[PDB]
Design an enzyme around this catalytic site. Structure first.
Site, PDB file in Angstrom:
ATOM      1  N   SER C 172       0.879  -1.157   0.000  1.00 21.78           N
ATOM      2  CA  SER C 172       0.000   0.000   0.000  1.00 21.78           C
ATOM      3  C   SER C 172       0.913   1.203   0.000  1.00 21.78           C
ATOM      4  O   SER C 172       2.057   1.107   0.450  1.00 21.78           O
ATOM      5  CB  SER C 172      -0.891   0.052   1.236  1.00 21.78           C
ATOM      6  OG  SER C 172      -1.690   1.240   1.264  1.00 21.78           O
ATOM      7  N   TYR C 187      -2.122  -0.006  10.602  1.00 20.05           N
ATOM      8  CA  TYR C 187      -2.158  -0.453   9.215  1.00 20.05           C
ATOM      9  C   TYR C 187      -0.916   0.003   8.457  1.00 20.05           C
ATOM     10  O   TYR C 187      -0.346  -0.764   7.673  1.00 20.05           O
ATOM     11  CB  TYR C 187      -3.434   0.071   8.550  1.00 20.05           C
ATOM     12  CG  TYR C 187      -3.616  -0.315   7.096  1.00 20.05           C
ATOM     13  CD1 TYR C 187      -3.181   0.525   6.073  1.00 20.05           C
ATOM     14  CD2 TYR C 187      -4.228  -1.504   6.744  1.00 20.05           C
ATOM     15  CE1 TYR C 187      -3.370   0.179   4.738  1.00 20.05           C
ATOM     16  CE2 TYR C 187      -4.410  -1.857   5.426  1.00 20.05           C
ATOM     17  CZ  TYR C 187      -3.985  -1.015   4.427  1.00 20.05           C
ATOM     18  OH  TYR C 187      -4.177  -1.385   3.115  1.00 20.05           O
ATOM     19  N   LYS C 191       1.928  -2.576   6.710  1.00 20.01           N
ATOM     20  CA  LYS C 191       2.200  -2.478   5.279  1.00 20.01           C
ATOM     21  C   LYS C 191       3.663  -2.130   5.012  1.00 20.01           C
ATOM     22  O   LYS C 191       4.270  -2.684   4.094  1.00 20.01           O
ATOM     23  CB  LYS C 191       1.270  -1.450   4.618  1.00 20.01           C
ATOM     24  CG  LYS C 191      -0.174  -1.914   4.473  1.00 20.01           C
ATOM     25  CD  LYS C 191      -0.252  -3.118   3.544  1.00 20.01           C
ATOM     26  CE  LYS C 191      -1.689  -3.528   3.299  1.00 20.01           C
ATOM     27  NZ  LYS C 191      -1.762  -4.828   2.566  1.00 20.01           N
TER      28      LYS C 191
END
Ligand SMILES: [Mg+2]
Ligand SMILES: [Mg+2]
Lengths: 276, 275, 276, 275
Positions: C172, C187, C191
């Site tokens: 991402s 998150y 990632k």
């Protein structure tokens, strides 16, 4: 045979190289007493703040100027901190002028231990697609890239002659990100070039010097509307522009024995701007 | 008032901009059928590889030269793949030349859809400290940076006039890392410049074009033994790459396979920049 | 003696390694005919679009699911493109389930040539300082990091057994930048971990496989207000969210012989979002 | 309405935020006189170097241990520099433990101004493919990532309560590059996580604290010969670093010398990440 030869630079000699002997006190690592610093673009702005902080740290300081007389600035450092300071007039765009200025600074102070390549020029002409005259492009490159290389090329000879030195190139967040909403591709290009020149020279000069960059973000010091600055603040995690006094600690860090294992690095001072 | 205005580029108009219609089948996205590509440095090496792969993809290709006549290479493209092709001589270090060259090229093919700026001046003179001729520095900056900017500056006007385009700048792992043991700070500097120029132009050209870089590692094209051995030792895949291992990325960036890809740097280096 | 030994990975053997023999036609480089792909998270979203594009390229496809039945999706690929496809139910958070699923896929298709580690989970709880229950943190790490590692660890054994393979980890922009205004540190952390795991494995598996990441930006596919998306568009150079169909070309690029010298790389597909 | 609201964090309030008053003399900016620092992994190695340098700068220092008693090391700080110091035992992999440890520490010193999260679990088991015990993976992730998050999660509440703070996370060049020839993907993964966790927390904590990382290279603290020789060959400075070469950066980030520095990664590696 009988030698671990560097993959980076054979002029290092047989490996490992020897660590410097340092003070066991962290505060002593930052003193510049007994050292000569040359700070370009020091008639004002960032270069002046760095020149004054280096004097506070005990260093003799050569300040540079071109458009405005800085002799009284250099005189002010002498009177205020009890340190040798002289001002030099030079167009950084002219490689012979740079060579002569550096050669002259070596005579007056004896040596140069710390050099700050502080090239000041900006692109204010908006998107490049509408600037059909390459004189704007060429002027950015000449001052902000070639001019930085002229200073580096000359000061490296002095560092190598002496087997020591610390070069700091002032880059910008523009070397890492694309500024918005003011479009300035030529300035971002030259600053990215500066940042990677510093890393390249770090390898080439490692037997005799360290090379690093400081990358300032938006520092409060032109044609910037209120709504432009507002957008900068909105995208800056700390929520504001920085002060020049918030840069001097990083410049002292890289100039001194506090960073003798620090080379080829980019110290970003930007309130977090490059993180989103 | 009432519109969402970009913080990047108000020339985008009210946001959000709109996506293109694309083929349903992933393989059709890579076709250059109906498009004109202009590939600098195309008389050999990487440039020629790219120009030939673009014709394989179905593109009219303008090839460039500076040393030897490339007209026959352009005739080979025209003969083998059934596309239009022509060779042009230009000193990309001279802006009048590239301006007149690119102006002539859009006249001859009608338009330009894909442009590959590929500079080929290398630095072979070792550590810069012993090179007191800024002639070598100036030469690298003039061809590998100024020359790339001249092509970009001129091709952008075409893309903007047509509202479409894809510019690929060939950079290098030298734009990201410092090559060892052959020291070449001026080359590394110009390639880092090219990499960030591409990112900057991607913001500026976003209403009408995409801009990306390919950064090749060590490619065996057309260096001492011990030097190359050290390159291999530091490359995770353990070898130099082939030009046929670059054309996939160049076609990816050139085609409708990458219509949301802009300002990116596609590294093709056998992992070299990872350790 | 008599051998150039890698500094990266001795299991490469004497250097240089040999380049693969490729088609001289660029278009053939992208075909997946004769190859088996396993695409996780392929009951919808990005994973489905990649699974379908790989079938278009000629590959047999193993799709993964957990919450929603995908047997009819796998059946749809068979009926539509004339390719072997089967669906597998597995909780990516459970390492034994992953091992058994991968081992079963190897039996049914014979081998696996391409693997896409596509871990789907999001953090929607705002700033972490107010989430005193570590169950949210631990769930992100388990699925988005550990679950990706479970898949990689298992598929690497198959690649090494066969001496070939291409692993793609879906990362991402959150692995490179800090998303705003929605704060999602857990998150972004997982990632970023994914992106550097892919580069680490690229070195370790280089004698038998390539490992790369795709890093999507904002792709139109939850608790995102209109004013949130508006800010995303304002900071995206192309000015919009992307479509899943704008990702499949990059996934095909990395899966196929178009990228046989591409390893340890991060292909960013983000409309320019990471550039400002 | 009427205010400029941050796109990063609305908790900043109406923009622009305001700058701190700072000493006129650059050397005073580095003083930790009047401040409390808490340095994990502080019974030796990098942690101890940092804890001692902070006391030299004038800071009360809480040191942490897990293996052997560090009470005497804390007594040395108290004796030599005339500051308050105490040693605490904690398994940072266990959140109750670090929560209770950090809660106890702010009780004992009054507050915490500077926190250094330093994880020390290393991966020595070679390529991960032959390590079928996720016990080693889980151990690295639990201490080097989860443990760092537990300390962060707890120290943020203190910084927010006081409206001030500086968090330094010790990462590694392993967060940026892939170490060779000793393969340690799980360690590299956790350190990259720490590096981006710091950046993420810098946005989230910006109204009350700064968050930065130090990424050391190869430091000779308290590995085969051929392995270290290859490290030297790939290091531009040609050697490993000393702990005394790290404390300058840790003091820079801890002090008022860096009040506009947040979300940054200060690499101290002899140039290792440059080639
Ligand atoms: Mg950004
Ligand atoms: Mg490297």
């Amino acid at each position: 045979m009988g030698e671990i030869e560097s993959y980076c630079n054979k002029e290092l000699g047989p490996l490992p190289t020897k660590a410097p002997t340092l003070s066991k006190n962290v505060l002593d690592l930052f003193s510049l007493k007994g050292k000569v610093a040359s700070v370009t673009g020091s008639s004002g702005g960032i270069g002046w703040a760095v020149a004054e902080a280096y004097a506070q740290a005990g260093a003799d300081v050569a300040i540079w100027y071109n458009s405005h007389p800085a002799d009284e600035k250099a005189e002010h450092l002498q009177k205020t901190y009890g340190v040798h300071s002289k001002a030099y007039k030079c167009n950084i765009s002219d490689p012979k002028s740079v060579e002569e200025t550096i050669s002259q600074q070596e005579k007056d102070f004896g040596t140069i231990d710390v050099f700050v390549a502080n090239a000041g020029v900006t692109w204010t002409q908006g998107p490049e697609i509408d600037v059909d005259n390459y004189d704007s492009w060429n002027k950015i490159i000449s001052v902000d890239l070639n001019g930085v290389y002229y200073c580096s090329h000359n000061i490296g000879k002095i560092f190598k002659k002496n087997g020591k030195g610390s070069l700091i190139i002032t880059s910008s967040i523009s070397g890492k990100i694309v500024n918005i909403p003011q479009l300035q591709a030529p300035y971002n290009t030259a600053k990215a070039a500066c940042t990677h020149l510093a890393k390249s020279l770090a390898i080439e000069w490692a037997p005799f010097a360290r090379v690093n960059t400081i990358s300032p973000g938006y520092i409060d010091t032109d044609f910037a509307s209120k709504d432009m600055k507002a957008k900068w603040w909105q995208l800056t995690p700390l929520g504001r522009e920085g002060l020049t006094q918030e840069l001097v600690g990083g410049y002292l860090y890289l100039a001194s024995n506090a960073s003798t294992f620090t080379t080829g690095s980019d110290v970003v001072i930007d309130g977090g701007y490059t993180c989103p």
